[PDB]
Protein backbone atom coordinates (compact mmCIF):
# COMPACT_ATOMS: atom_id res chain seq x y z
CA UNK A 1 0.00 0.00 0.00
CA UNK A 2 1.21 3.88 0.22
CA UNK A 3 4.79 4.09 1.17
CA UNK A 4 4.50 0.12 1.61
CA UNK A 5 6.44 -2.18 -0.94
CA UNK A 6 7.62 -5.41 -0.82
CA UNK A 7 11.28 -5.93 -1.78
CA UNK A 8 12.08 -4.94 -5.32
CA UNK A 9 12.62 -7.93 -7.77
CA UNK A 10 15.44 -6.99 -10.23
CA UNK A 11 13.59 -7.11 -13.75
CA UNK A 12 16.08 -5.16 -15.83
CA UNK A 13 17.46 -8.27 -17.91
CA UNK A 14 13.74 -9.17 -18.32
CA UNK A 15 13.72 -7.74 -22.00
CA UNK A 16 16.88 -9.82 -22.91
CA UNK A 17 15.77 -13.03 -21.48
CA UNK A 18 12.45 -12.86 -22.84
CA UNK A 19 14.16 -12.39 -26.05
CA UNK A 20 16.58 -15.75 -25.50
CA UNK A 21 13.58 -17.56 -24.71
CA UNK A 22 11.85 -16.57 -28.43
CA UNK A 23 15.05 -17.03 -30.17
CA UNK A 24 15.07 -20.85 -29.08
CA UNK A 25 11.26 -20.90 -29.83
CA UNK A 26 11.89 -19.41 -33.05
CA UNK A 27 14.42 -22.06 -33.91
CA UNK A 28 12.94 -24.89 -32.47
CA UNK A 29 12.00 -27.44 -35.53
CA UNK A 30 8.10 -27.78 -33.93
CA UNK A 31 7.95 -24.27 -34.45
CA UNK A 32 6.74 -24.01 -38.24
CA UNK A 33 3.28 -23.73 -37.98
CA UNK A 34 3.81 -20.48 -35.24
CA UNK A 35 6.18 -18.40 -37.00
CA UNK A 36 3.97 -16.35 -39.28
CA UNK A 37 0.35 -15.05 -39.13
CA UNK A 38 -2.72 -17.82 -40.13
CA UNK A 39 -3.35 -16.30 -43.28
CA UNK A 40 -7.02 -15.32 -42.60
CA UNK A 41 -7.86 -15.19 -45.91
CA UNK A 42 -6.56 -18.68 -46.85
CA UNK A 43 -7.88 -20.66 -43.96
CA UNK A 44 -11.64 -21.31 -43.62
CA UNK A 45 -13.37 -20.13 -40.56
CA UNK A 46 -9.72 -18.84 -38.54
CA UNK A 47 -11.10 -15.03 -38.84
CA UNK A 48 -14.62 -15.82 -37.25
CA UNK A 49 -13.61 -18.26 -34.80
CA UNK A 50 -10.34 -17.24 -33.38
CA UNK A 51 -10.25 -13.81 -32.00
CA UNK A 52 -7.04 -13.06 -31.16
CA UNK A 53 -4.99 -14.37 -33.68
CA UNK A 54 -1.17 -14.18 -32.21
CA UNK A 55 2.71 -15.67 -34.03
CA UNK A 56 6.33 -15.86 -32.73
CA UNK A 57 6.80 -13.05 -35.75
CA UNK A 58 4.15 -10.89 -33.69
CA UNK A 59 5.39 -11.23 -30.94
CA UNK A 60 8.96 -10.57 -31.72
CA UNK A 61 7.56 -6.99 -33.48
CA UNK A 62 5.67 -6.24 -30.22
CA UNK A 63 9.15 -6.99 -27.76
CA UNK A 64 11.37 -5.06 -30.14
CA UNK A 65 9.33 -1.74 -30.06
CA UNK A 66 8.48 -1.67 -26.26
CA UNK A 67 4.74 -3.10 -26.45
CA UNK A 68 5.22 -5.47 -23.63
CA UNK A 69 4.53 -3.64 -20.04
CA UNK A 70 6.32 -6.35 -18.02
CA UNK A 71 7.18 -10.33 -17.82
CA UNK A 72 3.77 -11.30 -17.97
CA UNK A 73 2.16 -9.79 -20.74
CA UNK A 74 4.85 -11.55 -22.93
CA UNK A 75 3.55 -14.96 -21.85
CA UNK A 76 0.13 -14.26 -22.17
CA UNK A 77 0.82 -13.82 -25.90
CA UNK A 78 2.86 -16.96 -26.16
CA UNK A 79 0.32 -19.02 -24.09
CA UNK A 80 -2.09 -17.41 -26.41
CA UNK A 81 -0.41 -18.71 -29.30
CA UNK A 82 -0.95 -22.18 -28.16
CA UNK A 83 -4.46 -21.68 -26.89
CA UNK A 84 -5.29 -20.62 -30.14
CA UNK A 85 -3.88 -23.92 -31.78
CA UNK A 86 -5.61 -25.83 -29.38
CA UNK A 87 -9.06 -24.33 -30.31
CA UNK A 88 -8.85 -24.62 -34.12
CA UNK A 89 -6.50 -28.14 -34.64
CA UNK A 90 -7.15 -30.79 -33.87
CA UNK A 91 -4.85 -32.91 -30.91
CA UNK A 92 -3.76 -35.47 -33.08
CA UNK A 93 -3.19 -33.92 -36.00
CA UNK A 94 1.08 -32.59 -37.07
CA UNK A 95 -0.18 -29.03 -35.79
CA UNK A 96 -1.89 -29.83 -32.91
CA UNK A 97 0.91 -32.02 -31.97
CA UNK A 98 3.62 -29.49 -32.58
CA UNK A 99 1.65 -27.02 -30.22
CA UNK A 100 2.00 -29.49 -27.44
CA UNK A 101 5.47 -29.94 -27.50
CA UNK A 102 5.91 -25.89 -28.16
CA UNK A 103 3.67 -25.00 -24.81
CA UNK A 104 5.92 -27.51 -23.07
CA UNK A 105 9.18 -26.42 -24.54
CA UNK A 106 8.58 -22.91 -23.30
CA UNK A 107 7.10 -23.63 -19.87
CA UNK A 108 9.94 -25.45 -18.69
CA UNK A 109 12.26 -22.45 -20.10
CA UNK A 110 10.04 -19.95 -18.56
CA UNK A 111 10.37 -21.43 -15.31
CA UNK A 112 14.00 -22.33 -15.14
CA UNK A 113 14.37 -18.53 -16.07
CA UNK A 114 12.40 -16.47 -14.10
CA UNK A 115 10.90 -19.11 -11.16
C1 LIG B 1 -1.13 -22.35 -36.08
O1 LIG B 1 -1.65 -22.71 -37.38
C2 LIG B 1 -2.88 -23.18 -37.40
O2 LIG B 1 -3.57 -23.27 -36.43
C3 LIG B 1 -3.28 -23.63 -38.76
C4 LIG B 1 -2.42 -23.44 -39.83
C5 LIG B 1 -2.77 -23.87 -41.10
C6 LIG B 1 -3.98 -24.51 -41.33
C7 LIG B 1 -4.34 -25.00 -42.71
N1 LIG B 1 -4.41 -26.46 -42.81
C8 LIG B 1 -4.34 -26.91 -44.20
C9 LIG B 1 -4.47 -28.42 -44.27
N2 LIG B 1 -3.43 -29.07 -43.49
C10 LIG B 1 -3.57 -30.53 -43.56
C11 LIG B 1 -3.50 -28.61 -42.11
C12 LIG B 1 -3.36 -27.11 -42.04
C13 LIG B 1 -4.84 -24.71 -40.25
C14 LIG B 1 -4.49 -24.28 -38.98
Redesign the pocket.
Known sequence: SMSVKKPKRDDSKDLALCSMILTEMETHEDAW??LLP?NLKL?PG?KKVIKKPMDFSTIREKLSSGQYPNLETFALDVRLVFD??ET??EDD?D?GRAGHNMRKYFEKKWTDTFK
Do not use: D, W
Request: glycine share 0%; aromatic share 28%.
Open positions: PFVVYNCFNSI
